[PDB]
Amino acid sequence: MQRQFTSMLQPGVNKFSLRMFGSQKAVEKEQERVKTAGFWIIHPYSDFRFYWDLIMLIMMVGNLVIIPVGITFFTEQTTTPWIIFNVASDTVFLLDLIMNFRTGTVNEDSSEIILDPKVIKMNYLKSWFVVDFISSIPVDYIFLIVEKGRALRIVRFTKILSLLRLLRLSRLIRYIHQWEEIFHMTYDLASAVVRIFNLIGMLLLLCHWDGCLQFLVPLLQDFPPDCWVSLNEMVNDSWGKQYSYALFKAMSHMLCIGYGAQAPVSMSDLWITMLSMIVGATCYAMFVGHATALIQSLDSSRRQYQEKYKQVEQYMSFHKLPADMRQKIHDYYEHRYQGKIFDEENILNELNDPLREEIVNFNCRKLVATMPLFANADPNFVTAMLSKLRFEVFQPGDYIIREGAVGKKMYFIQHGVAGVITKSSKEMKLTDGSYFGEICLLTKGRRTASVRADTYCRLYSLSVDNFNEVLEEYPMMRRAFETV
Amino acid sequence: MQRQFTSMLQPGVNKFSLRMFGSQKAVEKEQERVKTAGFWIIHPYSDFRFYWDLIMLIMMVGNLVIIPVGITFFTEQTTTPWIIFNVASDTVFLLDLIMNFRTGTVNEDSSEIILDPKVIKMNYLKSWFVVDFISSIPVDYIFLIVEKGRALRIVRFTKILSLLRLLRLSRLIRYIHQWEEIFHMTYDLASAVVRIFNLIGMLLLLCHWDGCLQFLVPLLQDFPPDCWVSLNEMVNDSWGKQYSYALFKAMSHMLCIGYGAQAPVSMSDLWITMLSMIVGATCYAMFVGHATALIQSLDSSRRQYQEKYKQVEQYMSFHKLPADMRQKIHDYYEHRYQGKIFDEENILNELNDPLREEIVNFNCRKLVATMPLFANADPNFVTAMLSKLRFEVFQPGDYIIREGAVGKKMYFIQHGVAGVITKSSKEMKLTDGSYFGEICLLTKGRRTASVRADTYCRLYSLSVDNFNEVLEEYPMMRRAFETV
Amino acid sequence: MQRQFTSMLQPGVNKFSLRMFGSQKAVEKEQERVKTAGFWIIHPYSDFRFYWDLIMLIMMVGNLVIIPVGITFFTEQTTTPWIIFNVASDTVFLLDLIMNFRTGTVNEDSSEIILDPKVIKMNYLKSWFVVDFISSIPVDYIFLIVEKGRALRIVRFTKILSLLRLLRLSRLIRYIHQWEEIFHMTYDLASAVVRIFNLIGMLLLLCHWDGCLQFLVPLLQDFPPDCWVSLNEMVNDSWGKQYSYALFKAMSHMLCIGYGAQAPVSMSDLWITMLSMIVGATCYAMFVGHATALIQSLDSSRRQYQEKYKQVEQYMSFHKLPADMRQKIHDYYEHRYQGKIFDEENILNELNDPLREEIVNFNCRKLVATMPLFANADPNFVTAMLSKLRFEVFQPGDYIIREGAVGKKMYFIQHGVAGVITKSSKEMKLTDGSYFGEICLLTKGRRTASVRADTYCRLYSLSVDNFNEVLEEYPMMRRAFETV
Amino acid sequence: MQRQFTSMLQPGVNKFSLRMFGSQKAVEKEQERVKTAGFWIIHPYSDFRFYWDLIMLIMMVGNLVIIPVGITFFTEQTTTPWIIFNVASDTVFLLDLIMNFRTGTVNEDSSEIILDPKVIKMNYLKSWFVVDFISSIPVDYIFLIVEKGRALRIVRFTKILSLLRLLRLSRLIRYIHQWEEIFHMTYDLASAVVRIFNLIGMLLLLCHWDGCLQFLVPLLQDFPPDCWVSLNEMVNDSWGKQYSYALFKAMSHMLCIGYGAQAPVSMSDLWITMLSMIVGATCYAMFVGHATALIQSLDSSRRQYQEKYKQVEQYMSFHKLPADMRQKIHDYYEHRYQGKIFDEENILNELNDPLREEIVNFNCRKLVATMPLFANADPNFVTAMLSKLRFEVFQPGDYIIREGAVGKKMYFIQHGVAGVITKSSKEMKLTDGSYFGEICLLTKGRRTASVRADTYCRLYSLSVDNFNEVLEEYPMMRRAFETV
Numbered sequence A, B, C, D: 001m002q003r004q005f006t007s008m009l010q011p012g013v014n015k016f017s018l019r020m021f022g023s024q025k026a027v028e029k030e031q032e033r034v035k036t037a038g039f040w041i042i043h044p045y046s047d048f049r050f051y052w053d054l055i056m057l058i059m060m061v062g063n064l065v066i067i068p069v070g071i072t073f074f075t076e077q078t079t080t081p082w083i084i085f086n087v088a089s090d091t092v093f094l095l096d097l098i099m100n101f102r103t104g105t106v107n108e109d110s111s112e113i114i115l116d117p118k119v120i121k122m123n124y125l126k127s128w129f130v131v132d133f134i135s136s137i138p139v140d141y142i143f144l145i146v147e148k149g150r151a152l153r154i155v156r157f158t159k160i161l162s163l164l165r166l167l168r169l170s171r172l173i174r175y176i177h178q179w180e181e182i183f184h185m186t187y188d189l190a191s192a193v194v195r196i197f198n199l200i201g202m203l204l205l206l207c208h209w210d211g212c213l214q215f216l217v218p219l220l221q222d223f224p225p226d227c228w229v230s231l232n233e234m235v236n237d238s239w240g241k242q243y244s245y246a247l248f249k250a251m252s253h254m255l256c257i258g259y260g261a262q263a264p265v266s267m268s269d270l271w272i273t274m275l276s277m278i279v280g281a282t283c284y285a286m287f288v289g290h291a292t293a294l295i296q297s298l299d300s301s302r303r304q305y306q307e308k309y310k311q312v313e314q315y316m317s318f319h320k321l322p323a324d325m326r327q328k329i330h331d332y333y334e335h336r337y338q339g340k341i342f343d344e345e346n347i348l349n350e351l352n353d354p355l356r357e358e359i360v361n362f363n364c365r366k367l368v369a370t371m372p373l374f375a376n377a378d379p380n381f382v383t384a385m386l387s388k389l390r391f392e393v394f395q396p397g398d399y400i401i402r403e404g405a406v407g408k409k410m411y412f413i414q415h416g417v418a419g420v421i422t423k424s425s426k427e428m429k430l431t432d433g434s435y436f437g438e439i440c441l442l443t444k445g446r447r448t449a450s451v452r453a454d455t456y457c458r459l460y461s462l463s464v465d466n467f468n469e470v471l472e473e474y475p476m477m478r479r480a481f482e483t484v
């Protein structure tokens, strides 16, 4: 029905279009846009364009493998099975040429998709149409028909024309790039992994085509007596032995492992071998470049923690700190960050208000809810107070607060054992989940006791400056703080 | 005419000189400077120096290819066509040597271009003059004339002198570097692409010269019976077969693919082969280094977004957040940044006032102009207010504001559907282009209703602290805000 | 005893578990957790799992070397020593398969270790159980027994089944990764060094297995007359010559150095050679990628200082500063940073209060304790004051303070000689450990004398704004400052 | 004299010691320290240790080349010239072993150089003494003397002992590293260039030693009939042909180019060839890693500007800005930064007060000195005011200030033409060196005219907030500002 026919050719409401246009009402504006651009236009982000390009990619990967083998290793392509393959492929590649006059273009400025038929047509003619045309039509068969109005020169010149089909590769590169840009904003892709697998496919294809070229240049010269096919005495072999040898010869040149059975002798074999070496050595260097970029993407977190740490070593070196002070700093960094590099202030600033209060409640509510000052309070005050907590780590034997020093912060133990000490009492231990320093909120001057970390304390602190800032916004709580 | 003759030798008012000197009046000071430095001086940034160096680069690329072939593969260069090529080239390379006593130098400190003839002369003598001189004059022809006041020793010793012309390569490297520094501040060049194409040109040239060297060392020894030219029986071949073989042999050594037809036998072939291997393996490692640097420049935006994200995963890992909270944070980052890394505060701080207000009007005027508070206002207040808007994203089911909580911000929907809810009414939906929270500007205390995101809201917020700051500068608006 | 039997299978209080769970009381909760999860469960972080996996890694590294040699180069494995090795190994690899139904899993979200037997079982079946099962059981021996209810086809088909044991490699990769994640949060490992040594082990193993494959494919074809083993006439050699040749042939293909004695002739040797070339060239590119990442980790501090410096050169270039001003800036950066890159404000903000006061006392107490203003003060004021000192460097001939200019800072000499000058006196020199500018704290307006650096002064400064801020917190000191 | 003898062995006052210890009085403390540590001690940073290590590096580079050639390619070393070379070298390497009991050690924590003879002795025994001892003494000659109390077994076993001298390489690596750490804090070295040249030296040496090993293993087996020396029929050749071949064979294996004349045949040649391939392929991958790191250090400024720019493109893409707005932003970035990346606020914060005022006077004094408000003022006010100027760039057609808008900044033209426009007058142009907006300092409310950039203005601005801040510190100027 025409409802499904026009539904297929407009950008459907899905994961990708919602993220590209911003809302279902933005998608439904772009739909209305194409539904009024002209008759039977195709949006680049349509399901029809997806499924067509998926058929094209399966056609192209098949033709670019089979075509140079069929031209090189078989005596003629005028038999029925080869006529059927080449006519069936060429009509599909000609439908694709026609649909490119119907399909809108994504703009480099992300502006409103080009959908006027006169601009979609005019931009294709100024770009890919000539390369897409001469690789779509059966140029070898129309030339052969024009010749019907010696045979072994025509049967050889048509092989060179028959390879104009290899320019389909330009559509393969273009249509792969367009669907990778779409799957990137859909499926959470590592860019270096995607670029590695595209290059491996291209390298295997170049090796395959060089393999055909190694035999094709001898074939077009009628296998002269100084070429590798004559020297290895394999002109009369089956197509599968000839192909396997030619592929082995190409792969040997391109990996720079050797020449095949012997070094070249004829001028054609010299220059085809040197071409293969230069192309293969260039392609291997690009592969090593991609492998290096993939490997650097894979331990970036560890690299970055080591760069951070090595700047801490530079600081201690510049100040000439003693070896036991350096070990104490190193030991603090390992307990405080646990090998992880992140910047908490940047990460929390990038979030929204719902995500920040959800993270803060997960970290801190199980600590602060147990304290009698907060067990009485309204949740919208508690969430505001928990956002002022600062995480601190202390090593064994550190004084967290000293008796007689001025109080400025309270502390809540997440982990580790502390101990409070005074001349008037025993050394009372405090453990994971407890709190201390609380009196500093509601006083001035001296702390009454010393608190010292017995194990590695992990703890949250609240300062008087922040506790007062969070009570300027809650006057109904300040009266209870002065009365409990 | 002398108007065009002196116009050619001074820095013309163009794209490059305007950006280098800062203004047309700065260019016209430098012009007056050269027009009074001495007779017929050449500014380094002149059109004459550009067109001369363009002639030199075409001469050098031609001579450095043709000269070692002519010396190596032809019996003598005393015939008329070779005398014409070598005399015509040497006079052009001698005019270039003379013009370098007339051409000012760019200083490493970017100070006023060196234009005193005594400093331009004295700096050239302390640097490149000796290498430029011995590669400019026909040292082989003056030596041959001095010999006219056995032949097969002189015809061989002159070949070694004739290769002093290869030091022209130093001018090719120098003049390429000078025009790349100029085209960089003209044409928006990726540095790694430029350095890749310079290296490919150098590698092809080194392979070509090694190809000549493979045959030249046998030739100067009169093709001894243990060398590759005698072993392969090609001493009597045409120059094109000998060159092709010698190039194939050099390229085989330098790509480390093999030796040619067989491993070396003579001491000359051993040491020339080992030299070729060391040079070629070094050059291939430098090529792989450049390919790696090019490939890292090409997906830098994706690499940087992945490094940023992997630090967000480290934060969630350190805090041991639940898997559904991690999925909610991951899902927020994908909607909030759409795979793009940038720092908006740094980018807006680097711009000028015209560009910031032009960007802010594009983003926000279509939202805020629809609101009755601002539809009455003067544009110079609206632009000041739009600069205080902050972009925020909310996920489905997030409460943007809760009933009874204290109001501090207003919101404008760019995209997505929100819904306002209360016991006194139905769930009124709000869509792309609407606004809510407006009462918070002109009150204190509780919000009257709950607003919850139904889809992913993309929205702009304005806080009361910023709305008050933007009204301290506009007292004529504060009276209308208290009265409308 | 059952105390040690259950003690072995629960996460022991040690360096790693203390850092993973956070405290001894957190470890003792996880212990109680496993001690009540079911009968005889194994925690992934146990000493039993460590020692078992250490036995497995020694078994796997031995079997994956010995098995493909025994299958390839020995006539049959039905003799007693091979039956003993294969049965003894297979029972150990079957105990390991059983213990994986008893061992808890580390979750990707770091949530509470999976310890319910029904989830530990169900997750193993959905993952590695099928690969671990078919590589644990003696599939070749049960098939051979099933055949007892022509011999040279069965003795060859069982060799292919006997290589199902190579899938043990999946356990080797898995168990190596699990213990590297544990040793990373234990022993301060450079990530690129660890990944280099894992890859070298894998490359040697792949070369060893390709070496067996080079001979195995001929062997299964009964050494046809066109294969390398027949061509090199070594079918009857000892196992050690055959292995050495086959390894040399594999290593030649994989390093792309050559084919062995000659290029391939048969279709099996062609395709096995091409497989070996593609695998080896891929593996070498991954090795070059890891070597590059290791080398970038090793001079990161130097790279980063050079990037920092090159941006200082860009600043001076943009402003077109004179060459002597650039030399003065370069000379300042070398004395001020001594080739070291660090950000002191970030490093001090990441520390705790004990570490900051410990570093500040090491740097500054030996200077400020000698001054009469501070020799009278309480240590808890001195430590607060020392934290406000700012490090400054001056070059020879710089005026640190000028007579008649307004005073705002005091200075303490760490290193270098300064000199104070006036019309009323001689040029009094001041040396390492002295102080000057002191009057500015207790006055207003003009400095009474000029101080100029004679050598490179390294000195600490205290500003009046900070000295006043550190006295708002100490009113008992402000009275002495007004009276001494 | 003893004054020069003790002067040589203590750290001299020079470029390096001044930067390492901080001041001449710090050097003179370390001198006094060594002058009282014990009899005849050597400081690691002495001139004597420099000149001794320079003699050692020339000895080591010579012995490590000559020794394996002399052992491998000459019939015996019992003749007088070889006895003289080996005895003269071994006594020098034994003096070096003795001086290491007299030389202090640099500590990894940069603490006071280890100078107690009992710690200098005890630390050497726990480290390098055993390797330095067995490579210092003539182990082959004392063994030969012990044998005097069949000859062709002893003459061969002594060759293996004679190669214990190759462990001198450990001193070469150690002493190179120590002098590179010293020259780094002396001479402004690119780290990747230094590491490249160390690796090239090591690669050439490994190739040279593998070249000796290729012939030595045949020699110790008495040239068996299946080895390359017998197969190539060169057992009776001169030492220079044998060396050249052996080097070519090693270099062929290590660059993976081929085997030499043919593939290996004997078990010794197989395993020595495979060892050479693995070592050479590893070393080439490390070389490619260093080349890649060097190449990334060389265009770091360009890479970093491109990464910065590509984040500006991501911002414009995220906001979907129009193509002409993107071109206007791109055009602004090119005029505002001129392809240069630097952070001016970080660079100025790292400088001292003398360098900041020296840079500010170079940029801005030639502008602001021409204005009548400042031509009357004291220089110590002008320098304070110039530090508040902010650099701004405007494009053609931008309004810098609009008539009737509120004034907040004044402007000084560095470059470009502006024009002031009003209904009451002609369009007055203003050029490089002029100023405008001046009235805003001494008023409130509306600007009287519009100023629009006609070309690209580069200009400095001063805001009223900063002009008032710079007058709070200068009350004697505020009266003139209210009266002129």
Ligand SMILES: CC(C)c1cccc(C(C)C)c1O
Binding pocket: A200, A203, A204, A206, A207, A250, A251, A254, A255, A280, A283, A284, A287, C277, C278, C279, C281, C282
């Ligand atoms: C062109 C072809 C022979 C090729 C070159 C470079 C690298 C590879 C793979 C092995 C990664 C490859 O297949």
Ligand SMILES: CC(C)c1cccc(C(C)C)c1O
Binding pocket: A277, A278, A279, A281, A282, B200, B203, B204, B206, B207, B250, B251, B254, B255, B280, B283, B284, B287
């Ligand atoms: C010197 C010459 C043979 C050469 C060496 C390295 C790399 C290349 C190209 C193929 C990139 C090259 O042509």
Ligand SMILES: CC(C)c1cccc(C(C)C)c1O
Binding pocket: C200, C203, C204, C206, C207, C250, C251, C254, C255, C280, C283, C284, C287, D277, D278, D279, D281, D282
């Ligand atoms: C597969 C095998 C032959 C191999 C390939 C790549 C690199 C190496 C080592 C020398 C690093 C290696 O042993």
Ligand SMILES: CC(C)c1cccc(C(C)C)c1O
Binding pocket: B277, B278, B279, B281, B282, D200, D203, D204, D206, D207, D250, D251, D254, D255, D280, D283, D284, D287
């Ligand atoms: C060991 C030796 C043959 C070697 C290996 C790797 C690289 C080089 C140079 C050419 C950089 C080299 O000389």
